[PDB]
Amino acid sequence: AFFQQQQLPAAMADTFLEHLCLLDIDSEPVAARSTSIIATIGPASRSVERLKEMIKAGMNIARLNFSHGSHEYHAESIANVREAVESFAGSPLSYRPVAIALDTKGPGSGGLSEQDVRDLRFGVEHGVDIVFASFVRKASDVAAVRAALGPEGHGIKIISKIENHEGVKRFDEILEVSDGIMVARGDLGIEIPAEKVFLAQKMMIGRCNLAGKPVVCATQMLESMITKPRPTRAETSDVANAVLDGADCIMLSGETAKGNFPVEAVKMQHAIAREAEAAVYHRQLFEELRRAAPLSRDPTEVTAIGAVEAAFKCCAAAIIVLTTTGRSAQLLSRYRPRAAVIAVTRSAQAARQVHLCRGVFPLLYREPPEAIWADDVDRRVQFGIESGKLRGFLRVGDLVIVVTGWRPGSGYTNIMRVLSIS
Amino acid sequence: ELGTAFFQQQQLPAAMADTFLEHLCLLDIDSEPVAARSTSIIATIGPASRSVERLKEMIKAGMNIARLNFSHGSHEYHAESIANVREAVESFAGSPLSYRPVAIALDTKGPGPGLSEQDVRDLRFGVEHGVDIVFASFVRKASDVAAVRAALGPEGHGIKIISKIENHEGVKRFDEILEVSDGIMVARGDLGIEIPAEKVFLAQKMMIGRCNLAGKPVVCATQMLESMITKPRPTRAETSDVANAVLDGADCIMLSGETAKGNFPVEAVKMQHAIAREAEAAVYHRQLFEELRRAAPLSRDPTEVTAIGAVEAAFKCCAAAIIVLTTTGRSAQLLSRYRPRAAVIAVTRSAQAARQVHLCRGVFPLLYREPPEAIWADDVDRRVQFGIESGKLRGFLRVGDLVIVVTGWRPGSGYTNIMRVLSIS
Amino acid sequence: RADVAQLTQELGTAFFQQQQLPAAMADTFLEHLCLLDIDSEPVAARSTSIIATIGPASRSVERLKEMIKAGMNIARLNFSHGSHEYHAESIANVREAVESFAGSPLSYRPVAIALDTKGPGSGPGLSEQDVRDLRFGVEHGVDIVFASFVRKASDVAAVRAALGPEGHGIKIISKIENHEGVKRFDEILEVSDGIMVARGDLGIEIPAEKVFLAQKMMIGRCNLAGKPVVCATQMLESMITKPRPTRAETSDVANAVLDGADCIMLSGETAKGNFPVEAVKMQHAIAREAEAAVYHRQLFEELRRAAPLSRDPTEVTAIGAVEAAFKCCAAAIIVLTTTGRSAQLLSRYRPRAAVIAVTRSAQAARQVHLCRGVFPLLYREPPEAIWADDVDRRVQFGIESGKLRGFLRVGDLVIVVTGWRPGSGYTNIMRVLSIS
Amino acid sequence: GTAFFQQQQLPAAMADTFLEHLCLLDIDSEPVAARSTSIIATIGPASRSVERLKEMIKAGMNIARLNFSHGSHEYHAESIANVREAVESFAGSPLSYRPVAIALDTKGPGSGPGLSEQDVRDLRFGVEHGVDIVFASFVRKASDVAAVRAALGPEGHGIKIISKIENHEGVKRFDEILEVSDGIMVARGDLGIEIPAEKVFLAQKMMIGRCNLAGKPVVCATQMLESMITKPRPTRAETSDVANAVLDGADCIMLSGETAKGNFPVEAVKMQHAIAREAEAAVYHRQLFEELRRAAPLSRDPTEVTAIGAVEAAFKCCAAAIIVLTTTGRSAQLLSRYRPRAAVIAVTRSAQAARQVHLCRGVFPLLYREPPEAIWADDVDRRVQFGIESGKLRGFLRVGDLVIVVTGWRPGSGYTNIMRVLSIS
Ligand SMILES: Nc1ccc(S(=O)(=O)N2CCN(S(=O)(=O)c3ccc(O)c(O)c3)CC2)cc1
Ligand SMILES: Nc1ccc(S(=O)(=O)N2CCN(S(=O)(=O)c3ccc(O)c(O)c3)CC2)cc1
Ligand SMILES: O=P(O)(O)OC[C@H]1O[C@](O)(COP(=O)(O)O)[C@@H](O)[C@@H]1O
Ligand SMILES: O=P(O)(O)OC[C@H]1O[C@](O)(COP(=O)(O)O)[C@@H](O)[C@@H]1O
Ligand SMILES: O=P(O)(O)OC[C@H]1O[C@](O)(COP(=O)(O)O)[C@@H](O)[C@@H]1O
Ligand SMILES: O=P(O)(O)OC[C@H]1O[C@](O)(COP(=O)(O)O)[C@@H](O)[C@@H]1O
Ligand SMILES: O=C([O-])C(=O)[O-]
Ligand SMILES: O=C([O-])C(=O)[O-]
Ligand SMILES: O=C([O-])C(=O)[O-]
Ligand SMILES: O=C([O-])C(=O)[O-]
Ligand SMILES: [K+]
Ligand SMILES: [K+]
Ligand SMILES: [K+]
Ligand SMILES: [K+]
Numbered sequence A: 001a002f003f004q005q006q007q008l009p010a011a012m013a014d015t016f017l018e019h020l021c022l023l024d025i026d027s028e029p030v031a032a033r034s035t036s037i038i039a040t041i042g043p044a045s046r047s048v049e050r051l052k053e054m055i056k057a058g059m060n061i062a063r064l065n066f067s068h069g070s071h072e073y074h075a076e077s078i079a080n081v082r083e084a085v086e087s088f089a090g091s092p093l094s095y096r097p098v099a100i101a102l103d104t105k106g107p108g109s110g111g112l113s114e115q116d117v118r119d120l121r122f123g124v125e126h127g128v129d130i131v132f133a134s135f136v137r138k139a140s141d142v143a144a145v146r147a148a149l150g151p152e153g154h155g156i157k158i159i160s161k162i163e164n165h166e167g168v169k170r171f172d173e174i175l176e177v178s179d180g181i182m183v184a185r186g187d188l189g190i191e192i193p194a195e196k197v198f199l200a201q202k203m204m205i206g207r208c209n210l211a212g213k214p215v216v217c218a219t220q221m222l223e224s225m226i227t228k229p230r231p232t233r234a235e236t237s238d239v240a241n242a243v244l245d246g247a248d249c250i251m252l253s254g255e256t257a258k259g260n261f262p263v264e265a266v267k268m269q270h271a272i273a274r275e276a277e278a279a280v281y282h283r284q285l286f287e288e289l290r291r292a293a294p295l296s297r298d299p300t301e302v303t304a305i306g307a308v309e310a311a312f313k314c315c316a317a318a319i320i321v322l323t324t325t326g327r328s329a330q331l332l333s334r335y336r337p338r339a340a341v342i343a344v345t346r347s348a349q350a351a352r353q354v355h356l357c358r359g360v361f362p363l364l365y366r367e368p369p370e371a372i373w374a375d376d377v378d379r380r381v382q383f384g385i386e387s388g389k390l391r392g393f394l395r396v397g398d399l400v401i402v403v404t405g406w407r408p409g410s411g412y413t414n415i416m417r418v419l420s421i422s
Numbered sequence B: 001e002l003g004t005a006f007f008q009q010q011q012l013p014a015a016m017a018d019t020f021l022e023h024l025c026l027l028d029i030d031s032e033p034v035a036a037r038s039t040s041i042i043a044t045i046g047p048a049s050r051s052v053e054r055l056k057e058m059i060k061a062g063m064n065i066a067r068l069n070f071s072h073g074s075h076e077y078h079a080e081s082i083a084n085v086r087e088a089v090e091s092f093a094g095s096p097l098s099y100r101p102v103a104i105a106l107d108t109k110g111p112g113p114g115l116s117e118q119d120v121r122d123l124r125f126g127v128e129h130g131v132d133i134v135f136a137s138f139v140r141k142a143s144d145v146a147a148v149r150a151a152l153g154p155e156g157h158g159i160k161i162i163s164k165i166e167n168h169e170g171v172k173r174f175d176e177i178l179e180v181s182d183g184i185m186v187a188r189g190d191l192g193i194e195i196p197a198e199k200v201f202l203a204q205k206m207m208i209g210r211c212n213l214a215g216k217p218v219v220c221a222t223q224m225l226e227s228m229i230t231k232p233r234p235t236r237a238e239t240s241d242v243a244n245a246v247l248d249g250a251d252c253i254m255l256s257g258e259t260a261k262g263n264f265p266v267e268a269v270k271m272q273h274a275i276a277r278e279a280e281a282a283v284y285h286r287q288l289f290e291e292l293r294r295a296a297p298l299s300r301d302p303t304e305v306t307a308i309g310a311v312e313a314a315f316k317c318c319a320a321a322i323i324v325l326t327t328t329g330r331s332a333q334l335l336s337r338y339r340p341r342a343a344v345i346a347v348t349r350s351a352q353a354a355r356q357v358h359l360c361r362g363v364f365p366l367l368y369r370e371p372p373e374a375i376w377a378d379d380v381d382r383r384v385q386f387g388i389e390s391g392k393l394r395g396f397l398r399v400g401d402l403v404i405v406v407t408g409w410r411p412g413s414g415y416t417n418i419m420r421v422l423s424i425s
Numbered sequence C: 001r002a003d004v005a006q007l008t009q010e011l012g013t014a015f016f017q018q019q020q021l022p023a024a025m026a027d028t029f030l031e032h033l034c035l036l037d038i039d040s041e042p043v044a045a046r047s048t049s050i051i052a053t054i055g056p057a058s059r060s061v062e063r064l065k066e067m068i069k070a071g072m073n074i075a076r077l078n079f080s081h082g083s084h085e086y087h088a089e090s091i092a093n094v095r096e097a098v099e100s101f102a103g104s105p106l107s108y109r110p111v112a113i114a115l116d117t118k119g120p121g122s123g124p125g126l127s128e129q130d131v132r133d134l135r136f137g138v139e140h141g142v143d144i145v146f147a148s149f150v151r152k153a154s155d156v157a158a159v160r161a162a163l164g165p166e167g168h169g170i171k172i173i174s175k176i177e178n179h180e181g182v183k184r185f186d187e188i189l190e191v192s193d194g195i196m197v198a199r200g201d202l203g204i205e206i207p208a209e210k211v212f213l214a215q216k217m218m219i220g221r222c223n224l225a226g227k228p229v230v231c232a233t234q235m236l237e238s239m240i241t242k243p244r245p246t247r248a249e250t251s252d253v254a255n256a257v258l259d260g261a262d263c264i265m266l267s268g269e270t271a272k273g274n275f276p277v278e279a280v281k282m283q284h285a286i287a288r289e290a291e292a293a294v295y296h297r298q299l300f301e302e303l304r305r306a307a308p309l310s311r312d313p314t315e316v317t318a319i320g321a322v323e324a325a326f327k328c329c330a331a332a333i334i335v336l337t338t339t340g341r342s343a344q345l346l347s348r349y350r351p352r353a354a355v356i357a358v359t360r361s362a363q364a365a366r367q368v369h370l371c372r373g374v375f376p377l378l379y380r381e382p383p384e385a386i387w388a389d390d391v392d393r394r395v396q397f398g399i400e401s402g403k404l405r406g407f408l409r410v411g412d413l414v415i416v417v418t419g420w421r422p423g424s425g426y427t428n429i430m431r432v433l434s435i436s
Numbered sequence D: 001g002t003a004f005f006q007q008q009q010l011p012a013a014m015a016d017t018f019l020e021h022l023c024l025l026d027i028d029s030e031p032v033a034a035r036s037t038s039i040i041a042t043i044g045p046a047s048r049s050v051e052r053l054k055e056m057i058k059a060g061m062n063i064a065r066l067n068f069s070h071g072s073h074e075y076h077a078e079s080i081a082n083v084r085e086a087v088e089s090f091a092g093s094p095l096s097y098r099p100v101a102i103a104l105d106t107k108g109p110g111s112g113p114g115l116s117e118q119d120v121r122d123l124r125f126g127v128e129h130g131v132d133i134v135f136a137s138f139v140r141k142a143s144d145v146a147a148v149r150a151a152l153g154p155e156g157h158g159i160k161i162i163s164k165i166e167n168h169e170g171v172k173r174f175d176e177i178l179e180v181s182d183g184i185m186v187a188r189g190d191l192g193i194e195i196p197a198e199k200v201f202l203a204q205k206m207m208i209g210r211c212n213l214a215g216k217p218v219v220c221a222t223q224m225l226e227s228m229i230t231k232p233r234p235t236r237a238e239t240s241d242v243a244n245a246v247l248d249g250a251d252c253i254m255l256s257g258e259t260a261k262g263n264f265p266v267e268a269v270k271m272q273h274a275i276a277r278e279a280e281a282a283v284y285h286r287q288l289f290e291e292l293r294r295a296a297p298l299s300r301d302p303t304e305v306t307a308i309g310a311v312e313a314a315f316k317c318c319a320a321a322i323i324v325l326t327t328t329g330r331s332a333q334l335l336s337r338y339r340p341r342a343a344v345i346a347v348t349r350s351a352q353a354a355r356q357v358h359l360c361r362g363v364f365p366l367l368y369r370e371p372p373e374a375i376w377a378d379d380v381d382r383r384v385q386f387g388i389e390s391g392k393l394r395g396f397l398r399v400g401d402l403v404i405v406v407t408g409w410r411p412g413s414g415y416t417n418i419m420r421v422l423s424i425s
C-alpha cells in the first residue's frame, strides 16, 4: 500500500518517459504540501474571520500590494493578519507561522522612488518579513532597496521582481545580491512578447534552483476564479507546471485580493501543488542538483547533502533541523528531498521567512529552556517529533534524519543523526 | 561553415546542455525560432469561423485541421461548413508557397451503454462527405472503438479514429483503448468534471507519454486560450498551458469556443502558432531522443529501422529536413515518433494521407499530382526533387544544405528501407 | 568548471592536478580515460590490501619486518605444504615482526594471519586433514580462513562447524576454483564472509580464455553485496626470478583494482622467489596508481542506485558519510567500530577518503584489512568513566594519529562516524569536523 | 528465440548499469560473432616457413610485422616473399580468401634527434617492396611523423603510418602526434623502461581512449602472452592483459617473441583469437555507443553522416553485418569508429586497402577480383552479393538475417551516402 501512494511507481522509473507513463490519478498524495502559497490581501480577504479561513486553507505568506491603499489601510491589514494568526497560538504543536510581505509600487517612469522609500520605512516600522521589490532592472536597484530598509531592516528578505527585458538580461547580477526572485508575469507579459514568458519563467526557476535561492511564480495562475467557483483547465495546468518547473512559491493576486472566491482559490492551489509535488521525478532531479551544487568546505553545506542522501536511502518521513536564521533548512531544501524539512526555531521572524523555501515546515519553539545546552537541543528535536506526529508528518516506526550543530549560535551545523520514531 | 549566428538561434545553446537543469538555465528569450511550426493546430468551426473569408484568414494564421462538433448543428449545417473549408483551402491552389492541405475531423456527440443512433448516422455522414478523422467522444473501452470502426463501414476504413478520453474509466482502460485506436485526445473539459480538477494534469502527462512511447498521435484539448473568447490577449496561465502541452509531447493542440464562437478566432490561432514555435525550439532533444530510442523495442521492420537511422543521421549533420516518400503516411509517422528537430517533408500522391499526417508532429505534407513516369526510379527522383524545390520555395532549404531522404526499394506501401544523405544543389 | 571553481581557488590548482582529479571530474567514462595523466601523482594512502604468502623466502623475522614496511597487510599460510610445526613457527615469526613496531600507533601496523586449506582433493566435502588444520587455526588464533575448492553452501557450513564454538569470529573467505563454484556462486557468497578468485585452479577447471569473465562477474557481485573479494595467482609471476615484472603483470594488478578487488595476492612471488620485498613494493606502487584512476563519479552513482533502500541506521549513516566526504574532498572518514562492520559499510561505497577505523579489538583491527580503504588503529587505553568522554577520546586519537601520519593536515575536513550507545550495531551519527 | 538472447553475453548487454552488466557476465554464454580485434604477429625464425605461415593465417593472423631492428634487407625480402606465397595459396577460393597486411617496424632514432640514416634506407626498402603499414619507432613529436612520410617519397603516399609511443615525450606530445599519424601503437616494452612500470597502464588506457575518440586505430603491444615463448599455456595475468586490452578499446593486439622466436607461434595466435572473441562479447555497447555518439562532433561529411545512421540502424534490428563498399577503406573506418556489434564486411577491389583495413576493429575485408560490369548499378550489386556469399560461407550470415548495406551515389572514393536495410535470402 505504501509503494502505491504518492506516485511511488512513477518515482521508481528508469527514464523520465517511463515516469510519465506510470503517473496514476488513483495514487493519492501523502506528504504535506511543500510549495508555499502567497495570497494578496485586499477587500475580499481583509477581515479577521476571512483570514482565519485562508490560514486553514493553506495561506503561508500574506502579500500587501503597496500600489494601492494608504499606510493606514495596510497597517490595519497587518493587524488583522496577526490577529488571525495568533488566534491559533493556544495549540503549540500545531501553530502555523504566516509571513507578511510588502510589494512595492515601483520606480514608475524614474531608480528608487520617493514613495518606495516611505513605504519601505513603513515596512521596517511594522516588522514585515519580506519585500517584493517591483521592476528590479540591475544590482544597484537591490542595493537601493537594502539601504532604504536601514540598520533596523537588516533581517528582511529582498525578493526581486523580474518584470521586463532588462531584468531578464541582467538576471545573474540581480540574483547574486537578492535573497530570491519573483517571476512577475503580469508586467513581463506586456514588456516582452506573451509567447516568450514561459522561457523566462523556466530559465529563472532553473537558475534559482541552481543557486539554492527561493523563486516565486506569480500572476493570473487561477485568474478565472476572480468571478467563477472553479478554474479553467489551463489554470490548473499552470499551477502544476510551476511546481514541476521547480518554483518554491506560487501566488494569488486578484483571486484573493478582490475576487468572489478567495478561500476556494487558496484551496485549489493547495490541492494542485500536493498532486504536482508527488509527480516530481526525484531520481533525476536529485542527481542533477547534487552534481551541479559546487564542492564545498562549509560544514552546513556538507552536512546538508549528507542528510538529504541519507533521507532518500531510508525513505525518511522527515529531516528535523535546528535553525536560528533558517539557513540550515534552506541548504537542505536546495536538494529537493521528498522528506519534509521540519525546521525548529526560536526566531518568530525566521519561522515566517522559511516559507520561501520549498518543503520547509517551520515550528516556532516556545517551551521552557533547559539548563544544559545538550539537553535543550534534544528537547527541540523531541518537540519536532511531537509536532510532526500531531500534524501527520510522522508515525511510530518511521525513520527521521536529525540535523544539529556542535555549539550554540548560527553557523555551526555539522551533525546528522539517524533516529527511529518512538 | 554555419557560423556563430546559427548556433545562437532556435535555443541551440540550451539544446547542447549536458543536463536538463543546465538546459533550463540556458533558455534565452532573445534566441529566435527558425524552424517551421511542427505542432498542428486544430480549430473548431462555428458561427465565428464558418465564412469562406474567415476560413482563409484562419488557414493563413496556421489552422491545419478543421474540427466539426456534431454535438450541435444539423447535417446540412456541417455539410456547408465542410464545403466552406474546402473552398477556402482550394483558393490557394494557384500559389505553391501558400497552398496547404487542411484535414477535416468529425467530433461525435457521444453515447447509453455504447454507440448511439445519432453517432451511427453522423459517422455515416462523415464517410459520405470524405472526412479524414473522427474524434470519438467518451471512449471508455476497446469495444467502443470497435463499434466506431464498424460504423465507418465498407468505404471508411482509411479514416483515422482518435479516441477522446473524458472520464475515469477511459483513463483506467487507456492501454486497451490506445492499442486499437489511431491516436488519443486528452478531452480536458469533461475529464475535469469526471475526475478531480487537480488531477487532470497527471492524466494529460501520462497519456501524452504513453502515446509518445507507442508512436501514435496525441491531441491536447479544451480551454487552452479560453479567455480569448472575449479578450484580444490570453492570460499568463493560458500561454503557459499551450507551451507545456508542446513540451509534454503533444502532437496537436486544439481550440474550441475560441474559434467556434469567440470574438477573436484568427488571433487565437495566431497565438497558438507563436507559442508552439517557441516551445518546439525549447524541447530538450538530447534526452528525449535518447529515451525514445531506449524505450522503443528492437525491430526487424525495415521502415522502423530506416526511420531511426534517418533521425540519427539528421541530428549528426543538423539536417534542414528529412524528405520521405509515403503513400499511407506510415513512413512519415515512424520518423515523427523519434521527434527529430529536422522537418519531415512527406511527399505523397494520396490527398487523404496528406491531410491525415497533420496528426503527427513535425510532418509537412506535400501533395504530388504529376502523372507517373514509366521508369519507376525516375518517378522516385522527380518526387524527391519536388520535395527539395518545395523546401527551397518555403524557406526550409538552401543550396549547400544537407537533407536526409527516405525511400523504399520497390513501389507500393510497406517497403521503406533506404536512407540517403543528399547535398542540396 | 563552476562545480569546482571555489574549491579550486581555496585548495589550489596543484591539488586538483594530483591523484587523477581531472579524470575524476569527467562527465563520461571515455573522457575519464582521455584525461588519465602519467604526471598526476597519487597522494592517498594505498587502499587495496596486499596478501603475501609466507614461505622460505619470507619466513625470517628480519625479512618479515621489511615486508611489513613494504606494505604486507595479510600473511597467508598455505596448508597444502609444510607441517603444523612449520606453520606455528611462521605464525610466531610474523607476530614477533608485527610486535616490533608496537611502541606507538604511529609505527604499529596490524597484520592479519590467514590459513589457506589444502582442500577436499578427490573427496565430496571436508577432508580429515582440513578438520585438523582448521582446529590448528583456532588454537593458534588465525584471523581468516581461505577455504579451498568451495563448490556449494554446505561446504562453507562444514568449515564453520570445524572451527568449533571458539572460532566463531574467524572470517571465512571461500575460494572459487571450478565450474561448480562459479555456477553456485550466489549461494556460496550468501553464507561466506567473502570470496577469493583462485585463478590458478580456475584456469585449469574452465577454459583459460574465460577466467577474466568469472573474475569480473565475482568481483561485481561481491561489490554489489558489500563483501570482500580477493584477486589471486600469477599476478606478478615473473618476479619469482626477475627484479621487474612483465607488461601483462603490471596491467593485471592495475585491472584487478579497477575491477573492484578489495585485496590482491602474492603466492610464489613472496613464498619462494628471489625478490619478495620488491614484489610487495610493486603491488603497492601499482595499486596506488590504479586506485587514483578509479572513476568514482559513475562507480558511486551505480553502487548507490543498485544498493536496495535500507532502514538499518549503520547503512544509512555510511552512505551519508561517503556523500559528505565527496562533497568536501575529505581527507579521511574516522569511524569507531567493535567488529569492523561500520567500517565495512563505509568501504562498500568506495569513498576516495581513507576510512580510519578506531577499535579496541585486536582481531577486528587485523580482519578489516579485507575491506578496501580501511586503515585500522588499535586503541589500547582503558575506558573513561563517562561513555561520551571515552567516545571523544577515541575520535581525538584517530585525529591525532591521522595528523602525525600525514593522512590529515590542519585545515582539512574529516567526517566522523559514531553511535548513540555502547556495543556493536548502533552506529547512527555523522559529523563534519575541521582539523585545527 | 530464447537461445539467441542467452549467447554472446546478451543478458549482460541488456543491463541498465555497468555494475549489473558485470554481475550478469556468464562463462557458459558462448561467443557467436566473428573475432573483431586484429592480431599482429611478428615474423621471425619460428614463423618464416611458408607452411607455418599458412597455419598462422588459418589461426587468425591478420597483419605480419617485420621487425627491422634485426636482420638484413635480404632477410626481410625473403620474409615478405614467404608471407605473400602463404597468403596467395588461398586465392583460388575467392569467397574465403583472407588478406594479410605487411607492416614494417623501424629500428628507430637511437641516440639521434630524429630520422636515422638506417631508417631512411629501410623506409625506401618498404616502398620498393610494397609494405602496407609502417610502425614508426620512438615517435616524440609531429615532425618525426613528417620525416617518416617524406622518406616514403611520392610512391609511398598510400602507406599507413602508425606512430609508436615509447617514452615520456611521446606521451606528453600525444595529441600533436595523433593529429598527423594514421594511428598509434602503445609500445609497452620501451614505455615500461622510459616511465615507471606502474604507470604504463595509465598511458595505455589514455592513448586507447584518445584514439577511440579520434576514430583512428590503436595497437596494444609487447609481453601480452610472453610466457608462451617457452610454455604451451599462458599465465593468468597474460590472459587478463589480452582481455583488458580489448575491453579498453584496442583495435589490434600484438605478438612479438611469441611468434618471432618462440616454440608456440600458432598456439599464441589461437590464444589471442580465443580471448579476443570472449572479451568482444563482454563489451558494454549500451554505454560505449552512447558515449562515442555523444563525443563525436557534428559533421557535414556524407560518409560520416551515413556511417552513424548505419550503426544506429544495425543496433535497432540486431543486424548480423554492415556490408560496405570501399575504395580506400575510409567508409569502413567511419563505421568501425562507432563500435557496432554487427561485423563490418568491407568489399574492395584495392588489394592494399583490403590489407590496411585490418587496423580498424570489426572490419572484415573481402578482396573482389572481377573486372567492372558495364552497368555501374549491376557492378555495385555484384559486390554486395559477393559480400553476402562470403559472409554465408564464413558463418557471418544466414538466411533470414538482416544486414545494413552502405554504398555511394557515383563511382570513385569519397561519395558514400546511402544506407539500405536488406533481408538475407
Ligand atoms: N531541474 C530539473 C531536473 C529534472 C527535471 S525532470 O522532471 O526529471 N525532467 C524534465 C523533462 N525532461 S525532458 O528531457 O525535457 C523530457 C521530456 C519528455 C520526455 O518524454 C522525455 O523523454 C524527456 C527530463 C527531465 C526537471 C527539472
Ligand atoms: N570508452 C568506453 C566507454 C564505456 C566503457 S564501459 O565498459 O561501459 N565502462 C567500464 C568502466 N566503468 S566504471 O565507471 O569504471 C565502473 C567500474 C566498475 C563498476 O562496478 C562500476 O559501477 C563502474 C564505466 C563503464 C568502456 C570504454
Ligand atoms: O541554520 P543556522 O542559522 O546556521 O542555525 C543553526 C544553529 O542551530 C543550532 O543547532 C542550535 O543553536 P542554538 O542553541 O543557539 O539555538 C546550532 O548548533 C547551529 O549552529
Ligand atoms: O509510408 P508507406 O505508405 O509505407 O509508403 C512508402 C513507400 O513509398 C515508396 O518510397 C515509393 O513508392 P511508390 O512509387 O509506390 O509511391 C516505396 O518504395 C515505399 O514502400
Ligand atoms: O561497527 P560496529 O561493530 O557495529 O561498532 C560500532 C559501535 O561502536 C560505537 O561507536 C562505540 O561503542 P563502544 O563504546 O562499545 O566501543 C557504538 O556507538 C557503535 O554501536
Ligand atoms: O570508402 P571510400 O574510399 O570513400 O569508397 C567509397 C566508394 O565506393 C563506392 O561505393 C563504389 O565505388 P566504385 O564503383 O568506384 O568501386 C562509391 O560509390 C563510394 O564513393
Ligand atoms: O507586479 C506583478 O506582480 C506583475 O506584474 O505580475
Ligand atoms: O469533448 C471535449 O473536447 C472535452 O470534453 O474537452
Ligand atoms: O589455490 C589457489 O590459490 C589457486 O588455484 O589460484
Ligand atoms: O618497440 C616495441 O614494440 C616496444 O618497445 O614495445
Ligand atoms: K505592487
Ligand atoms: K462533440
Ligand atoms: K592451499
Ligand atoms: K623495431
Ligand SMILES: [Mg+2]
Pocket (backbone or CB within 6 Å): A134, A163, A184, A186, A187
Ligand atoms: Mg508588476
Ligand SMILES: [Mg+2]
Pocket (backbone or CB within 6 Å): B137, B166, B187, B189, B190
Ligand atoms: Mg467532452
Ligand SMILES: [Mg+2]
Pocket (backbone or CB within 6 Å): C148, C177, C198, C200, C201
Ligand atoms: Mg587452488
Ligand SMILES: [Mg+2]
Pocket (backbone or CB within 6 Å): D137, D166, D187, D189, D190
Ligand atoms: Mg620499442
